Amino acid sequence: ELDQLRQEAEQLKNQIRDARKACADATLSQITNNIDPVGRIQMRTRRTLRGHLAKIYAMHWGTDSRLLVSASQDGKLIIWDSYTTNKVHAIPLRSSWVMTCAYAPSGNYVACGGLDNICSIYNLKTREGNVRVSRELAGHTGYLSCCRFLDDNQIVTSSGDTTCALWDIETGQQTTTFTGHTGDVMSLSLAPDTRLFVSGACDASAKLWDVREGMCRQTFTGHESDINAICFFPNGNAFATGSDDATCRLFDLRADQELMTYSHDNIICGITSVSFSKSGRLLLAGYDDFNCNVWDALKADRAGVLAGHDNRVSCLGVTDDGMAVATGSWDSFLKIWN
Template identity: 55%
Template structure:
């Protein structure tokens, strides 16, 4: 029997699984492995799922506002993840313990984006307060703050270069800024300009040779 067609004439693809438990919008989802998934939501929680069983295993409920983003520790044992929330904090969680193990404060507004450093010992945050911060989970604190008085737009997304030397940040004002992680956080490494509306997402490819930015201007741009 042929696959059912959509109104456009293309074959419709049906979902293999449907996961239901959140009470708010879904802001982010990340696979841990082929059977495990993490999600974050406007209901102020994150959920750890068994995809094959269509079952919510653990709910993480310590945030006091919408959870906007999450990132999974880049290692073989992917039990640790970090989340960013509208309560202006980032929290580190352990799925084995089912609870928060670190809370990182410092931002003055919503934390919209989080991303682990390539070696897993630190993570970056991006906030509506127009700054990014680099938190070290070993020293339990911020080791750099990226921003200056000329930057007044909120940060929507963050990603590291393959080496971790550069931190890329997408902004509400259509810009993408690149920061040198080892330098003074007030000076930019460079800026990418080309979008006509807010940069809503970005990511670096696995080889580190290209950056892709997505914008409300309906365009994706690849920078090499």
């Protein structure tokens, strides 16, 4: 009976809750008590990457930590030389409504996606010398929210149709599709080991997936609104979630429960972009109040604010060496912090 199945599901949820409570012998805040505080963390805008003429909905850092791609509503993908302000490429987009952008680890490809429901993979190292789209991945019934490159042939795409998928670039087909989120998926984070990847959706739940299996391993709850941003802890055994309820949450895959809630009374706007530092000591978050508050993961005490954007910080990325932070916002300007 359907009622019997629902009762069994409720009993299983209660068992999961009981196990999670039994695992919570001590809180992370209590453990992080004798730790030396981070102090006042303050950076200035080292570089102001300007040239975008619309709101910047996405930005990714290359593996070299020098080339950065930015997606804006103007219909242009710009590859920036962060060291010396330069536009290596200005890729025109068929769909100006782009919400995600991804730089391949090898640096040869860049992806963009949005309301077109298509992940367009652009080839940069072409003999013709102009950026051309290698493949247009189609099959998602909802808007593209986040894409991340596993390699030159594999990409994982999160969409608003409550599904995520692993794509094969040369064939253009979905090798594996991930299903189980109730609401629209907005952000996905690839683990540093690349075996797993976690994604946050509108159902206030984050789910850790296996790219070679296709089944959800663990689901994490705790938020009261849509999870807008997600990023993996550099260890790869934890991750952080930004949601519209003005609080960040750091979950752990070895305990499947929340560890710390990064909330302040002053901030009421939600988090649009979440990114960790190199050591995980800094949980940089992009809020809708035209600010980017630098948090401390171990102690939920604010370390600093990245004021300087006239509009909402929509994207936030940290380099592979931890040298710089990009805070692309709706003010049509990207800023590099250090």
